[PDB]
């Protein structure tokens, strides 16, 4: 810089001291913070966090929490407590079924779940995603493809 | 040797480069340069000290050190006080040319 | 050997005062210092450099 | 499991060319010399300093980009995924390492790239021990004489249909290799769930390809015809790596190399389907030229 | 394809000189010629004033011959001696800045250095001279500016040569303004009895739309590999602005099947385009989409 020069300096040295270093940003620590990645390279981080399902229609607040909480989701896949948070952009947390609410010892099929989803933002469509968005959280043979919904 | 001028950027070679080579020695303090800490003069430490007859011989002994390091093509002859106005002492830096 | 700066202390001067030479002595200081080079080279008054041994 | 590290390069910082970096520095030089700039100031030793500076952050914008490549798993090179895989509990293993049977012929070998990268990609699918769709897969890749797995369930619940496919040669995997997955899935599954291990869960039909390619009047037809299988013989080994489909266009696009003007296909009348259950095998190929 | 002058062997006529091996010969030619009548080899003898002239002025004449032998060789001449090599090969020394000043200090007429004449005298052979073959009709057809590359043909042997000029301004058609701009150059830079039928082209914009029903996995990389296959489509078609112009169906499979797509469906390319040199091609656009 011009400050790194000795006290004796011309205006030429002080000018070339302000140009010849030519400092640059180093955007390298920002690559692993999902709240500080740029929007053009956010799905690179979503790949290494193994975000299984992705939509190019969400807001960035709904894209970055799927990467930031990709650990807590993938740590507990068989639980309900991350089935609650896997449906984050579709804002819905209403009701869930369990064994003893049905009196005759469960359904034939040993209680596949029929969860309750309550969306209010999008009304057209928004059904055909939830049987496959919830597929990774669902185990391969602990549930059946029976599903319940609400608009 | 052909270098460029400090101001105005013009490449001047023979003896105008010789004079600005000396005045980069005398006016840089020590350690002000980057990665070259043993460069420059202690004349900035001699700034605003009383002009005694031991101050004169300490400037002759320090210009000769600092020009002896980074100016081998100048043989220093003498440094003399030639005038005194309020604060402004002025020194006739005389030396023969070698190299 | 942790030292604290002033608002005008500079890196190549400091590790010349500590080590005695500058051949291989600045980048070894920048190696074992997190976020030192990110800070501006005319230092602020309260940043700490841990100078390593064998530069 | 699809490789991301074969795409065009992402630029985290922009990589400008040499001229607009240079003119940006002159715009910084006119503003710094403001009030005292003259046209005689920008002399020959002054401009060649600015041509150095325009060359050095051309090497710094290339340095920030090359650093940002090797941090992301997309375009990370060797001896650096060990720094990333330590953050994902992925350590490379030893495939017959340096045991000196005789001391000067040292035979050292580690795990290579682009499958170690898959194990870093399959890191978060190994945390959940309650068995999602990929934890039955990612724990079944512990063996060596196989290829990756696909999971499905047609029958009654807690009956897992996993298709253990294997790349070692002509089709069928050995049944002694089949028993290793139940030793690999004991404290990884759910305890009430119970799997059946089917090696070929749908069946194998024999496939071939016969292509009459044309090459340009030009370079030699010996290494360019053989270069068509360089993108094909690794493509067939990657079909049951995901257990997914081949197409008619898979028999076209895997034969286009540098120096192709037209191709030809006869072996399928229409394309075949290979689902998550269905897989197949290709017996023997014959790709020649029509000219 | 020229050879550098720094790898040439040294010639025969250029000699290293020595004052002693001329002067010790003049001693060894005069001492035997006196037959012992002169034997004072002290320098104060006035023959050694003169034998140090006949060995010094000869060394000047031996050097003038070496100076003149370098002046007639291309790898050693300089100054006004490459002007004589330059005047024989119709090559003149350049003018970077002009000769005449407007101010009181005279601006020197800046000529290029003699190290760049050796560039230009040696490139005076591989130079555009006449449009004989197919590689020279097109390079002599670079008089206009708003235009991309071109190729030539000849349907009969004895008379006619065909050049199908296409210029990228709008859709790639050749305007009638640059039809005459080509024909102004080919009248004196061709062989004289050419029937240079410089039309626009036989067929220019033959609109080749593309559509691709891309089928992807809906995961995280579905935005990145969709634009990566789209970027491979951009520089492909931009390389198809050509008379090789092999617009196809299966050559666009490898463009779009990049690493991880499931399949593709090309609708408007259904068959391969039949190829001749005379016609041209154009792509009007596309409507890229996801399968779902």
In this complex, which of D8, D252, D261 lies closest to E253 when CB atoms are compared? D252
Q: Quick check: B34 contacting C, CB < 8 Å?
A: yes
Cα–Cα nearest to D72, from D87, D59, D58? D87
Q: Using only C-alpha atoms, what is the Rg of chain E?
A: 35
Cα–Cα nearest to D171, from D8, D282, D14? D282
E contacts of A53 (beta carbons < 8 Å)? 218-219
Q: Indicate the pairing of strand B74-84 with strand B11-12.
A: unpaired
E-chain residue closest to A136, CA distance: E219
* Chains in contact with chain D (at least 3 beta-carbon pairs closer than 8 A): A, B, E
What is the stated resolution of the deposited model, in angstroms? 3.5
In this complex, which of D41, D42, D44 lies closest to B11 when CB atoms are compared? D44
Strands of D195-198's sheet in order across: D149-152, D160-164, D195-198
Which of A4, A5, A6, A23 to mutate to probe the C interface, most C CBs <10 Å?
A4
Task: Dihedral sign for Cα D256, D260, D261, D262, please.
Answer: negative
Task: Dihedral sign for Cα D115, D116, D122, D128, please.
Answer: positive
Could you give the CA distance from residue E277 to residue E271 in angstroms, rounded to a whole number?
Answer: 19
- Please state, in angstroms and as integers, the Cα–Cα distance from residue E190 to each residue in A127, B96, E151, E155, following that order: 72, 72, 15, 17
CA angle A88–A94–A95, rounded 5-degree value: 120
Q: Quick check: E215 contacting D, CB < 8 Å?
A: no
Q: Does the beta-carbon distance from C38 to A1 stay under 8 Å?
A: no
Cα–Cα nearest to C42, from B40, A2, A15? A2
D near B: at least 3 beta-carbon pairs less than 8 Å apart: yes
Q: Helix (H, G, I), strand (E, B), or coil: what is residue D63?
A: helix
**Which uninterrupted H or E stretch holds E184?**
none
Could you give the CA distance from residue D228 to residue D247 in angstroms, rounded to a whole number?
Answer: 17
Could you give the CA distance from residue A113 to residue A115 in angstroms, rounded to a whole number?
Answer: 6
Q: Quick check: D44 contacting B, CB < 8 Å?
A: yes
Answer yes or no: are the C-beta atoms of D50 and D41 closer than 8 Å. Answer: no
C near D: at least 3 beta-carbon pairs less than 8 Å apart: no
Write out the two tokens for A92: 């819905």
Count of C-beta atoms within a 10 Å radius of residue E85: 18
Contacts of D137 (CB under 8 A, 6+ apart): D122, D125, D148, D149, D150, D151
Length of chain B: 99
- Please state, in angstroms and as integers, the Cα–Cα distance from residue E64 to each residue in E78, E231, E290, following that order: 15, 67, 82
Q: Helix (H, G, I), strand (E, B), or coil: what is residue E169?
A: coil
Contacts of D214 (CB under 8 A, 6+ apart): D260, D261, D262, D263, D289, D290, D291
DSSP code at position D133: T
Count of C-beta atoms within a 10 Å radius of residue D5: 16
Contacts of D66 (CB under 8 A, 6+ apart): none
* Chains in contact with chain C (at least 3 beta-carbon pairs closer than 8 A): A, B
Could you give the CA distance from residue A119 to residue A150 in angstroms, rounded to a whole number?
Answer: 7
Count of C-beta atoms within a 10 Å radius of residue C36: 17
Q: Does the beta-carbon distance from A56 to E223 stay under 8 Å?
A: yes
Q: Does the beta-carbon distance from E219 to A55 stay under 8 Å?
A: no
Q: Indicate the pairing of strand D195-198 with strand D160-164.
A: parallel
Could you give the CA distance from residue E246 to residue E274 in angstroms, rounded to a whole number?
Answer: 8
Write out the two tokens for D62: 């290339």
Could you give the CA distance from residue E183 to residue E1 in angstroms, rounded to a whole number?
Answer: 30
Contacts of D17 (CB under 8 A, 6+ apart): D58
Answer yes or no: are the C-beta atoms of E120 and E91 closer than 8 Å. Answer: yes
Q: Got the DSSP string for E81-126?
A: GHHHHHHHTT----BSS-S--SSSSPPP--BPPHHHHHHHHHTTSS
Write out the two tokens for D148: 């990756």
Q: Quick check: A4 contacting C, CB < 8 Å?
A: yes
Cα–Cα nearest to E231, from E258, E264, E253? E258
Q: Helix (H, G, I), strand (E, B), or coil: what is residue E168?
A: coil
E contacts of D6 (beta carbons < 8 Å)? 258-259
Could you give the CA distance from residue A73 to residue D124 in angstroms, rounded to a whole number?
Answer: 9
Touching B: A residues 11-70, CB under 8 Å: 11-13
Count of C-beta atoms within a 10 Å radius of residue A56: 11
CA distance from start to end of chain E: 56
Q: Does the beta-carbon distance from E223 to A51 stay under 8 Å?
A: no
Axis-axis angle for helices D44-56, D18-32 (nearest 10):
130
- Please state, in angstroms and as integers, the Cα–Cα distance from residue D243 to each residue in A1, B46, E200, following that order: 59, 84, 54
- Please state, in angstroms and as integers, the Cα–Cα distance from residue D148 to each residue in D182, E26, E290, following that order: 15, 95, 27
Contact pairs from chain A to chain E, CB under 8 Å: 22
For tokens 């394309």, the residue is D271
Q: Helix (H, G, I), strand (E, B), or coil: what is residue A17?
A: helix
Could you give the CA distance from residue B61 to residue B42 in angstroms, rounded to a whole number?
Answer: 10
Q: Does the beta-carbon distance from A10 to B7 stay under 8 Å?
A: yes
- CA A133 to chain C, closest CA, distance in angstroms equals 42
Within E107-252, residue ranges assigned H as helices are: 114-122, 134-137, 177-183, 224-239
* Structure determined via: cryo-EM
Q: Quick check: A1 contacting C, CB < 8 Å?
A: yes
Answer yes or no: are the C-beta atoms of B6 and D41 closer than 8 Å. Answer: no
Q: Got the DSSP string for E142-154?
A: -S-SS-----EE-
Could you give the CA distance from residue A112 to residue A99 in angstroms, rounded to a whole number?
Answer: 10
Within chain A, residue ranges assigned H as helices are: 11-17, 42-48, 60-68, 70-75, 83-86, 130-133
Answer yes or no: are the C-beta atoms of E275 and E245 closer than 8 Å. Answer: yes
**Which uninterrupted H or E stretch holds B84?**
strand B74-84
C-chain residue closest to B35, CA distance: C12
Count of C-beta atoms within a 10 Å radius of residue B77: 13
> At residue E165, what are phi and psi to the nearest 5 degrees?
-80, 125
Could you give the CA distance from residue E53 to residue E19 in angstroms, rounded to a whole number?
Answer: 11
Write out the two tokens for D155: 């029958």
Could you give the CA distance from residue E242 to residue E148 in angstroms, rounded to a whole number?
Answer: 8
A contacts of D122 (beta carbons < 8 Å)? 50
D contacts of E258 (beta carbons < 8 Å)? 6-7
A-chain residue closest to C38, CA distance: A26
Q: Is C19 exposed, middle or buried (0-12, 13-18, 19+ CB in 10 A)?
A: buried
- CA E221 to chain A, closest CA, distance in angstroms equals 6
Contacts of E217 (CB under 8 A, 6+ apart): D2, E260, E262
Q: Helix (H, G, I), strand (E, B), or coil: what is residue D185?
A: coil
Centroid of chain to Cα E113: 20
Could you give the CA distance from residue D75 to residue D58 in angstroms, rounded to a whole number?
Answer: 21
D contacts of B9 (beta carbons < 8 Å)? 40-43, 45-46
- CA A140 to chain D, closest CA, distance in angstroms equals 6
E contacts of D249 (beta carbons < 8 Å)? 250, 253, 257, 263-264
Answer yes or no: are the C-beta atoms of E268 and E208 closer than 8 Å. Answer: yes
Q: Is C15 exposed, middle or buried (0-12, 13-18, 19+ CB in 10 A)?
A: buried
Contact pairs from chain B to chain C, CB under 8 Å: 10
- CA D20 to chain B, closest CA, distance in angstroms equals 24
């Amino acid at each position: 810089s011009s400050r790194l020069l000795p006290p004796n300096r011309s205006s030429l040295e002080r000018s070339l001291g302000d140009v010849l270093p030519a400092e640059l940003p180093v955007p390298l620590r920002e690559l692993h913070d999902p709240a500080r990645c740029e929007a053009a390279l956010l799905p690179y981080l979503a790949w290494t966090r193994s975000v299984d399902r992705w939509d190019p229609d969400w807001s960035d607040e709904a894209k970055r929490n799927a990467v930031a909480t990709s650990f807590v989701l993938h740590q507990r896949k068989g639980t309900l407590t991350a089935l609650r948070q896997v449906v984050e952009p579709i804002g819905a947390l209403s009701e869930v079924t369990e064994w003893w609410q049905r009196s005759p010892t469960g359904v034939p099929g040993t209680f596949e779940i029929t969860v309750d989803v309550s969306d209010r933002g999008i009304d057209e469509g928004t059904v055909l995603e939830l049987e496959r968005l919830l597929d990774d959280v669902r185990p391969v043979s602990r549930h059946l493809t029976r599903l319940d919904l609400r608009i | 040797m052909i270098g460029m001028d400090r101001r105005s950027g013009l490449p001047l070679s023979g003896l105008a480069h010789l004079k600005q080579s000396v005045e980069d020695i005398l006016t840089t303090p020590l350690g002000s340069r980057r990665m070259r800490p043993e460069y420059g003069s202690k004349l900035r430490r001699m700034v605003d000290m009383p002009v005694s007859e031991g101050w004169k011989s300490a400037v002759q002994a320090e210009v000769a050190r600092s020009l002896g390091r980074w100016e081998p093509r100048i043989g220093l002859s003498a440094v003399r006080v030639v005038a005194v106005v309020d604060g402004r002492v002025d020194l006739l830096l005389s030396g023969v040319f070698e190299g | 050997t942790t030292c604290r700066t002033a608002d005008g202390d500079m890196l190549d001067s400091l590790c010349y005062h500590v080590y005695g030479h500058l051949l291989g002595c600045v980048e070894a200081t920048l190696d074992a210092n997190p976020g030192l080079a990110d800070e501006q080279q005319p230092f602020r008054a309260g940043l700490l450099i841990s100078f390593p041994d064998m530069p | 499991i699809i490789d991301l590290s074969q795409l065009p390069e992402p630029e985290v910082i922009e990589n400008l060319d040499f001229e607009t970096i240079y003119q940006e520095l002159l715009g910084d030089f006119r503003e710094a010399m403001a009030g005292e700039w003259t046209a005689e100031v920008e002399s020959d030793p002054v401009l060649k300093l600015l041509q150095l500076a325009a060359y050095r952050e051309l090497l710094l914008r290339a340095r920030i980009n090359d650093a940002a490549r090797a941090v992301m798993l997309a375009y990370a090179s060797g001896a650096d995924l060990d720094q990333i895989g330590a953050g994902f509990n992925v350590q490379r293993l030893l495939i017959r390492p340096a045991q000196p049977e005789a001391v000067p012929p040292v035979e050292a070998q580690y795990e290579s790239d682009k499958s170690l990268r898959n194990r870093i990609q399959l890191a978060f699918e190994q945390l959940s021990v309650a068995g999602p769709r990929n934890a039955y897969i990612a724990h079944a890749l512990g063996a060596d004489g196989r290829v990756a797995d696909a999971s499905a369930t047609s029958p009654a619940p807690c009956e897992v249909l996993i298709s253990v496919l294997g790349v070692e040669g002509n089709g069928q995997a050995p049944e002694a290799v089949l028993q290793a997955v139940r030793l690999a899935l004991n404290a990884e599954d759910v305890r009430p769930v119970a799997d059946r291990v089917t090696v070929r869960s749908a069946g194998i039909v024999p496939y071939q390809v016969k292509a009459q390619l044309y090459l340009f009047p030009g370079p030699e037809a010996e290494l360019i015809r053989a270069a068509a299988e360089a993108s094909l013989r690794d493509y067939i080994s990657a079909q049951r790596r995901l257990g997914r489909d081949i197409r008619r266009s898979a028999l076209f696009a895997t034969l286009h190399v540098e120096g192709v003007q037209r191709v030809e296909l006869q072996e399928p009348a229409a394309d075949v389907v290979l689902d998550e259950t269905q897989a197949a095998y290709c017996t023997g190929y014959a790709i020649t030229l029509g000219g």
